[PDB]
Amino acid sequence: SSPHMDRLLGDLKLLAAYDSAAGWQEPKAMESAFQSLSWDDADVLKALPQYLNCRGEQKRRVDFAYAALCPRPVDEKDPKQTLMSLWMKARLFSYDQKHPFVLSPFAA
Amino acid sequence: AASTIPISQWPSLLYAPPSSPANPAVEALPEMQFDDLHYPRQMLLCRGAGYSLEQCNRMAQPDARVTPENPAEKLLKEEAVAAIACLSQREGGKDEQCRYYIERMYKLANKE
Amino acid sequence: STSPGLAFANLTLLLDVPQLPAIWAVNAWRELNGLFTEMKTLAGTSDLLYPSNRYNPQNEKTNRMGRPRKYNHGEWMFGNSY
Amino acid sequence: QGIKTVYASCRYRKLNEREIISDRYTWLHERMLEDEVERVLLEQVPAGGFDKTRPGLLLGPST
Amino acid sequence: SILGAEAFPELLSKVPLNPQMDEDKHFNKYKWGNEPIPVNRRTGSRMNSSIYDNRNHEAVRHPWSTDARTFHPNDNPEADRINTQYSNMVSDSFPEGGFSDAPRFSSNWERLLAYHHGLYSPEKFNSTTKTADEIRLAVNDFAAKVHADDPKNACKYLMIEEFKCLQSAQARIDPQGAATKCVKWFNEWRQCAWDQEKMVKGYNYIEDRRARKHKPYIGAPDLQYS
Amino acid sequence: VDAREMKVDMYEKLFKQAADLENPCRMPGVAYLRCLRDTLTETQSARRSSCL
Amino acid sequence: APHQRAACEQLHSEYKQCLAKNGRTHFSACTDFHSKLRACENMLGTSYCIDEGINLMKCTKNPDPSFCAKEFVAMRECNRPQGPHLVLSSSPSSPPHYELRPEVKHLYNVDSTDLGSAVAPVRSKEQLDRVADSLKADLNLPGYGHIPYKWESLRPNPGA
Numbered sequence A: 001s002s003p004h005m006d007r008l009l010g011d012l013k014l015l016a017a018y019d020s021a022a023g024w025q026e027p028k029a030m031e032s033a034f035q036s037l038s039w040d041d042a043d044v045l046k047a048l049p050q051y052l053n054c055r056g057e058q059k060r061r062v063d064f065a066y067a068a069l070c071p072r073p074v075d076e077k078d079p080k081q082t083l084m085s086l087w088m089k090a091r092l093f094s095y096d097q098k099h100p101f102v103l104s105p106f107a108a
Numbered sequence B: 001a002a003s004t005i006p007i008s009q010w011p012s013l014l015y016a017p018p019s020s021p022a023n024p025a026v027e028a029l030p031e032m033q034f035d036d037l038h039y040p041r042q043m044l045l046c047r048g049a050g051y052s053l054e055q056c057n058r059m060a061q062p063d064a065r066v067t068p069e070n071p072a073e074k075l076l077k078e079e080a081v082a083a084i085a086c087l088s089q090r091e092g093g094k095d096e097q098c099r100y101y102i103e104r105m106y107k108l109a110n111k112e
Numbered sequence C: 001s002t003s004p005g006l007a008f009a010n011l012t013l014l015l016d017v018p019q020l021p022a023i024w025a026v027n028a029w030r031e032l033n034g035l036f037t038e039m040k041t042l043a044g045t046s047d048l049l050y051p052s053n054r055y056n057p058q059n060e061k062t063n064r065m066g067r068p069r070k071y072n073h074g075e076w077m078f079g080n081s082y
Numbered sequence D: 001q002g003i004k005t006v007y008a009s010c011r012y013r014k015l016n017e018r019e020i021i022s023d024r025y026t027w028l029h030e031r032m033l034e035d036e037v038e039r040v041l042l043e044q045v046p047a048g049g050f051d052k053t054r055p056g057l058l059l060g061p062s063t
Numbered sequence E: 001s002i003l004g005a006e007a008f009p010e011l012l013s014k015v016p017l018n019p020q021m022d023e024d025k026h027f028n029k030y031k032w033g034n035e036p037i038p039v040n041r042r043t044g045s046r047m048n049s050s051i052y053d054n055r056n057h058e059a060v061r062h063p064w065s066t067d068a069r070t071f072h073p074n075d076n077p078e079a080d081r082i083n084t085q086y087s088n089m090v091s092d093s094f095p096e097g098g099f100s101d102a103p104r105f106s107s108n109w110e111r112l113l114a115y116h117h118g119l120y121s122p123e124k125f126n127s128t129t130k131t132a133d134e135i136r137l138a139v140n141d142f143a144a145k146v147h148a149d150d151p152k153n154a155c156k157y158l159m160i161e162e163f164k165c166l167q168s169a170q171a172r173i174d175p176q177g178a179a180t181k182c183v184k185w186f187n188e189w190r191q192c193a194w195d196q197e198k199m200v201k202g203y204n205y206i207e208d209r210r211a212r213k214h215k216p217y218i219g220a221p222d223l224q225y226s
Numbered sequence F: 001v002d003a004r005e006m007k008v009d010m011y012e013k014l015f016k017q018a019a020d021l022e023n024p025c026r027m028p029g030v031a032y033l034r035c036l037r038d039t040l041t042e043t044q045s046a047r048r049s050s051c052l
Numbered sequence G: 001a002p003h004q005r006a007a008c009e010q011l012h013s014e015y016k017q018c019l020a021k022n023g024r025t026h027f028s029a030c031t032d033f034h035s036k037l038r039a040c041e042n043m044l045g046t047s048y049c050i051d052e053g054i055n056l057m058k059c060t061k062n063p064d065p066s067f068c069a070k071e072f073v074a075m076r077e078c079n080r081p082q083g084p085h086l087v088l089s090s091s092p093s094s095p096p097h098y099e100l101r102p103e104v105k106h107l108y109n110v111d112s113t114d115l116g117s118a119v120a121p122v123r124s125k126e127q128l129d130r131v132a133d134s135l136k137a138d139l140n141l142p143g144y145g146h147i148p149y150k151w152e153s154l155r156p157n158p159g160a
Ligand SMILES: CCCCCCCCCCCCCCCCCC(=O)OC[C@H](COP(=O)([O-])OCC(O)COP(=O)([O-])OC[C@@H](COC(=O)CCCCCCCCCCCCCCCCC)OC(=O)CCCCCCCCCCCCCCCCC)OC(=O)CCCCCCCCCCCCCCCCC
Pocket: G152, G153, G154, G155
């Protein structure tokens, strides 16, 4: 009944778990985290190629939100990290194109 | 083996962290940025120019001075899309079902 | 002649008595550089020269530390700014 | 070495004198430039000077 | 209508967010197990540190009532500290959730008076530790601002280093402890300032002649220094 | 030109003591005074176009 | 008279240019201009630091043990637009004093206008004793002069 919210919070928890398991040297845990990351979402899958070709204001909004949630730059060589980043960005892109973000504190 | 890092060595630990299975881009760690003053500064400048609050909020735009984008998202586009298709079909790559695409990506990025 | 107990003196001699020509040459070069510096000073300079200093880069357009002089674009009634 | 030292003593005395006077001339140069700047600035003062009783900019009500 | 169905994949798939969760829920996906962070390192109060203080290893006294059980730093750590990231290192000197010495004021004038006398700042008392990402963001913004202020300045990276050390040492919550770490870089900046002023404004001195025994031994080399 | 340099140095010293790095107007002020330093050997009419 | 004011400003700039061209060694060439500059001064109420500049130039080539410090400060204070802030008091007393004008007293951190003598003190056992006694009284430290151990000797002060 709240799938978008639920899947968002789950994705964030799984990212945190991946980072912790990497720090603690735990391939089993971090692969479990990678596998449990909501890859079966049709909306995000449809929005992925749209994000990959978007440009301008929408892209800047989504980049701002992604840098808020995950400002660390992932290693350009690690495809698992790259893919989870892409997935999170596609999710945010879907949410933004349904209901755009309002990031300023000044608003009415 | 992994010995304690005293408090005096933490500034070097922040920009030269130890090795992990999931490392960041150490060369780009000085380039990660996120301005908490972006919108306040924008509003201050526009209100000093002479605009109203509504005009400022309509003219406001989000910061471009954030952490740069991964170049892999533009270079390895098709490979990443195929990997994500494989994952969506095969339940996150359980028991080594997206190893093909992941290994192709790894080779392309690393080159021995 | 020699002995194992004289290894200290043997090594020191072999390594140092060949250096004495170079030491005397260094001393002579230093005296000549001092002579030339004093002759230049007697001839005259815009800014002073420190005699016992390694390097003296000061001129009309350069500080005593190798940087450009501040406030040196115009001319001044009392002459040089130094 | 004694001859060299006598000559060096004379030279160092003269050099100390020159260095002191040079530093003081540099000081005077800078101060004269400051005086020129002040002379130019005093032209921008309004006729009758500044109203030192009030604030220059009144930036709010007093109710 | 159940609450939060799709929101606990950590529970559905037995994924632990940390070794403490792994140990608690018995998922057993951490090969190396878990050494629990004890309570004296998970929480506690600010203490005095110097041996030249009479109340050393005693809790700091405040106008308000506060638990006097202190945070104990890790003085005898284990050899293998598998996670050597800042996340696990910071717990040896500060508690991540902040200290337990914060007030809840019954009135606003008490807050005012404490601040006025220098015994309260919310920056200091209602706050957690900063994460490495936050520290890096702050440092990089400050570095950008300093570079914009002046590129042709020699004390630039020294100022950046004192800022970095304060942030890493968590000066928001332990300012005296952090200043104790960062005043060295402040001193180096203080030196660089004069070295730059004396290079800009040409300042030099009459050096004396060479000493008779500048070299201790004739066969020794007299390495020339500027 | 020497007195112009001195005036700009006075402006910079005063403004840098007044505004700290947390201040928002510091960067614009320093940039404007740096442009004045760049354009000392010029007239106000030519300097306006560049420093505006 | 604005015509005359501008003419005199031009004359002063010309004098400065000539003086700079000749240098501070050859300064007796520009005695031409004093004739007119003193008249400018008497007419417009202006000062041009002529005597001070000339005295400084003369002194720095045959310097004093003071190294011409009073000349330097005199020139610096003459060249101010609104007048000298700091001057050297004229006295029948032997030692001269540095004095500060009253109308600029609010710019300086002083209780009075007298900034002390313009020459350093003379060495005196009595003045040293006085200063040391005053400092001891102001400090008021019980423990000064206490000697917990002294080398055993017939001499009162062993060593010193
Ligand atoms: C048997 C051998 C012969 C024994 C006699 C030898 C001693 C002769 C001297 C006797 C006189 C000493 C003075 C006494 C008066 C009180 C003063 C005093 O006590 O202070 C000195 C000293 C304490 O010092 P102090 O507490 O700081 O007091 C203030 C200063 O001392 C003083 O104030 P100051 O610090 O400002 O003065 C500094 C400065 C001022 O003076 C000077 O600067 C100059 C002094 C040198 C003068 C040079 C001579 C002058 C020459 C001029 C002429 C030249 C031309 C002609 C000659 C040419 C030469 C050929 O220098 C001195 O004062 C130096 C003092 C020298 C102390 C004596 C050193 C000898 C120690 C004992 C040696 C024992 C040998 C073995 C014994 C074996 C027996 C079994 O006490 C002693 O020296 C103790 C002497 C005790 C004699 C013991 C005799 C043995 C008896 C057997 C007993 C058995 C038990 C012993 C244990 C082991 C047994 C097995």
